[PDB]
């Protein structure tokens, strides 16, 4: 037992990270087969970042302008294209470490592992969620752009996020691996702001089931609630609405613990209305919302990957 | 910016994990050069676990009793020895993925990354601390024994922990890679119990510096305190004593933020005495103690590894 914020093993992704340098900008790229993917603002300069016209900017570039370091080795660029906000550098060598992989665009509420990188070298791995307002609460310094987020499913890496920028609240915005931003954000330095976040209700319920699986029961009650009456309380506390579909997803966990979904909703309702009274759940004094129902079942049953 | 519980990239360790099966027991082993390291209770049976005599148990074994899976391959055992509570299986193939590495026995308060494994296959990676009572608050199910904890320093993996058992409070006990248990624990099923844990004071102060680096300042004050008067408050709240040596270690962080160590102690004192008044620090409603001063400097400055 025990319950931790757990990231996927990062080895399959580490073998893909490279350094991309162009002009005065250095950031990370993702090397899969003979293509290196990276944020298109690598073509920008310190004065370009204001309101750049990237199509104009890119036509002025030559392959040799792009310096691509894979550890201790030049990769030669032989072609380049732009897809949405990502740049695709064709290189003359296929990455022999290329895992089985997929690109996926995730829904808000879904979680992933981030391999933070600088200069093409991995620094650390941690677990994030796509917030309802399409930011992520990351840990990113200058040079971290092109670090990716991902999930692993048996032997297949599903890449879902590439880091582009930091918002003035200290949170982070980026794209899928096809270069489409999550949320309303754009890669230019104009006024943008997150807009109001909310708590991921179905994940909070999943984490309460994790707590029960692990022996914290102090918050259970004999009450129950209807879905409608629960959502009336949810909206007051800035929680996302719980749909019948969420209820269905929580079925396995409800079946393992013996606690009907709407009974767990009654418990969340009283925790919202009363607070925790000096008590903790799974070592937290806040209601945790960055574990999905799948995350809870993975970690409480022990699923692996090769 | 941002601040997360960050583990080391796990790739160098993933390449070392193997499956060790003997009789009815299956657990994980660590394959470095031509030796596989694993917990010695793999030689035990369901009735052996009570009060076993492992030296008697081991003399009854033959090399061929030990089944060692490295993915899709038999490794043949050609010799075996016992060192403290770990078993060392000599195999006829050196691991070509063996990283540069070291075995280190860590002090309480120090943190490390755990690569949780089942059947020789990595499941997830998370960050832990060695508690003052020499347990770790892990996430471990049946089959996880032989999963290791580690730190990485440039290109060198320092292995510091191997998982052996779970205590009735849901926390975990294990050894260094030379097989010596951390704390008073033994690998037999007799009454054992953790004994009273305490909060890692120097780490809490490091995390408060992280908060300042990241823009949370609401908890600062103009007070200060002496070391003696701080430790008088520490002991009341079950915090470990802060030594002058801890104060010295916190020097770099104090210099970066402009906040003298003993001034940060004055702030911790008021947080201990007043609580947080509905406020959070770095997204936590509790005072966090599983980041060392080194962890904070690593993540706030961006150090990498190859
Ligand atoms: C790439 O490595 C870098 C990562 C940042 C640096 C600090 N933390 C991070 O995550 N990304 C950038 O530097 C990007 C590149 C652009 C688009 C041109 C600017 N940028 C930023 O992150 C900006 N942020 C903004 O300007 N944000 C808006 C426009 C106000 C929303 C800063 C952080 C450099 C100011
Ligand atoms: C190895 O994979 C396994 C990991 C455990 C299983 C549940 N969570 C874990 O971390 N370790 C064990 O099964 C070890 C092997 C022994 C020494 C023989 C027993 N054991 C345990 O963890 C015991 N725990 C205890 O018996 N603890 C004491 C003696 C009461 C302190 C249990 C969990 C199997 C009961």
- Give the distance from residue A76's alpha carbon to the nearest chain B alpha carbon, in angstroms: 21
Q: Are A18 and A75 in contact (CB under 8 A)?
A: yes
Three-state SS for B30? strand
Q: Are A177 and A157 in contact (CB under 8 A)?
A: no
Residues of A (33-72) whose Cβ lies below 8 Å from B:
71
The overall longest dimension of chain B from CA atoms, in Å, is 69
Of B176, B156, B161, B114, which is closest to residue B12 (Cα–Cα)? B156
Cβ A38 under 6 angstroms from ligand 1: no
**Distance in angstroms (rounded) separating the CA atoms of residues B52 and B71:** 31
Rounded Cα–Cα distance for residues A17 and A99 (Å): 12
Question: How open is the CA angle B138-B139-B140, to the nearest 5 degrees?
Answer: 110
Angle at A167 between CA A166 and CA A168, to 5 degrees: 120
Sheet architecture: strand order including A66-69:
A74-75, A66-69, A17-22, A25-32, A35-39, A86-91, A77-83
Strands (E), chain A: 17-22, 25-32, 35-39, 66-69, 74-75, 77-83, 86-91, 100-103, 111-118, 121-129, 148-153, 156-166, 172-175
H/E element holding B232? helix B227-236
Measuring CA to CA, how many Å separate A30 from each of A38, A69, A90, A95, A115? Answer: 7, 11, 12, 10, 11
Cβ pair B1:A141 closer than 8 A: yes
How far apart CA B80 and CA B91 sit, in angstroms, is 9
Rounded to 5 degrees, what are φ and ψ at B88? -120, 110
Nearest residue in B to A118, CA atom: B304
Backbone angles phi, psi at B223, to 5 degrees: -60, 170
d(CA B162, CA B180): 10
Instruction: In whole angstroms, give the CA distance from residue A53 to residue B123.
Output: 44
For residue B244, the tally of other CB atoms under 10 A from its CB is 9
Which residue from A170, A183, A150, A267 is spatially nearest to A218, judged by alpha carbons? A267
DSSP H helical ranges for A182-292: 201-213, 227-236, 244-249, 251-257, 261-274
Method: X-ray
What's the CA gap between A54 and A40, in Å, rounded? 8
Task: Give chain A positions within 8 Å (CB) of B14.
Answer: 9, 11
Q: Name the β-bridge partners of A38.
A: A87
Q: How many CB atoms lie within 10 A of CB B240?
A: 21
Q: Is the CB of B2 less than 8 angstroms away from the CB of A171? A: yes
CB B153 within 8 A of CB B305: yes
Contacting residues of B for A116, CB less than 8 Å apart:
6
Gaps after which residues in chain A, C–N over 2.5 Å? none
- The protein residue whose alpha carbon is closest to atom 26 in ligand 2 is B189
Question: How far from A67 is each of A19, A49, A82, A295, CA to CA, in Å?
Answer: 8, 20, 17, 39
DSSP letter at A180 equals P
Question: How do beta strands A100-103 and A156-166 pair?
Answer: parallel
Q: How many residues does chain B have?
A: 306
* Four-CA torsion A198, A199, A201, A207, nearest 10 degrees: 170
What torsion, rounded to 10 degrees, do the Cα atoms B113, B119, B123, B125 define? 0
How many residues are there in chain A? 306
A306 vs B120: CA distance, rounded Å? 9
* 8 A C-beta contact, residue A256 and residue A213: yes
Distance from the first to the final alpha carbon of chain B: 23
Indicate the burial class of B298 (C-beta count within 10 angstroms; 0-12, 13-18, 19 or more). Answer: middle
Could you write out the DSSP letters of every residue in B190-228?
Answer: S--------B-HHHHHHHHHHHHHTT--TT--S----HH
Q: Judging by beta carbons within 10 Å of its beta carbon (0-12, 13-18, 19+), is residue B299 exposed, middle or buried?
A: buried
Counting one residue from chain A and one from chain B, the pairs whose CB atoms sit within 8 A come to 161
Catalytic residue selected from A16, A22, A38, A41:
A41
Question: Which of B166, B173, B195 for a ligand 2 pocket mutation test, highest count of atoms within 8 Å of Cβ?
Answer: B166
Report in angstroms the alpha-carbon separations of A174 from A114, A147, A150, A161, B6: 12, 10, 13, 7, 20
Neighbours of A243 (CB within 10 A): 13
Closest CA–CA distance from residue B181 to any residue of chain A (Å): 20
């Amino acid at each position: 037992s025990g319950f931790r914020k757990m990231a996927f093993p990062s080895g399959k992704v580490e073998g893909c990270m490279v350094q991309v340098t162009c002009g005065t900008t250095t950031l990370n790229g993702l090397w899969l087969d003979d293509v290196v993917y990276c944020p298109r603002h690598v073509i920008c300069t310190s004065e370009d970042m204001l309101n750049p016209n990237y199509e104009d900017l890119l036509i002025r570039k030559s392959n040799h302008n792009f310096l691509v370091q894979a550890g201790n080795v030049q990769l030669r660029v032989i072609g380049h294209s732009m897809q949405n906000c990502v740049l695709k550098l064709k290189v003359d060598t296929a990455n022999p470490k290329t895992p089985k992989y997929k690109f996926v665009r995730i829904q808000p509420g879904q979680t992933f592992s981030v391999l933070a990188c600088y200069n093409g070298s991995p620094s650390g791995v941690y677990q994030c969620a796509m917030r309802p307002n399409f930011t992520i609460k990351g840990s990113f310094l200058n040079g971290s752009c092109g670090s990716v987020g991902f999930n692993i499913d048996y032997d297949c890496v599903s890449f879902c996020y590439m880091h582009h920028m930091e918002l003035p609240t200290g949170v982070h915005a980026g794209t899928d691996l096809a270069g489409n931003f999550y949320g309303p954000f754009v890669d230019r330095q104009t006024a943008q702001a997150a807009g109001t976040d909310t708590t991921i209700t179905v994940n909070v319920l999943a984490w309460l089931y994790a707590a029960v699986i692990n022996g914290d029961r102090w918050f259970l009650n004999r009450f129950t609630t209807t879905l409608n009456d629960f959502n009336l309380v949810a909206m007051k506390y800035n929680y996302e609405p719980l749909t019948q579909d969420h209820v269905d997803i929580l079925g396995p966990l409800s079946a393992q613990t013996g606690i009907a979904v709407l009974d767990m909703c009654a418990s969340l309702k009283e925790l919202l209305q009363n607070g925790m009274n000096g008590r903790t759940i799974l070592g937290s004094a806040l209601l945790e919302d960055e574990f999905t129902p799948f995350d809870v079942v993975r970690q409480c049953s022990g699923v692996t990957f090769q």
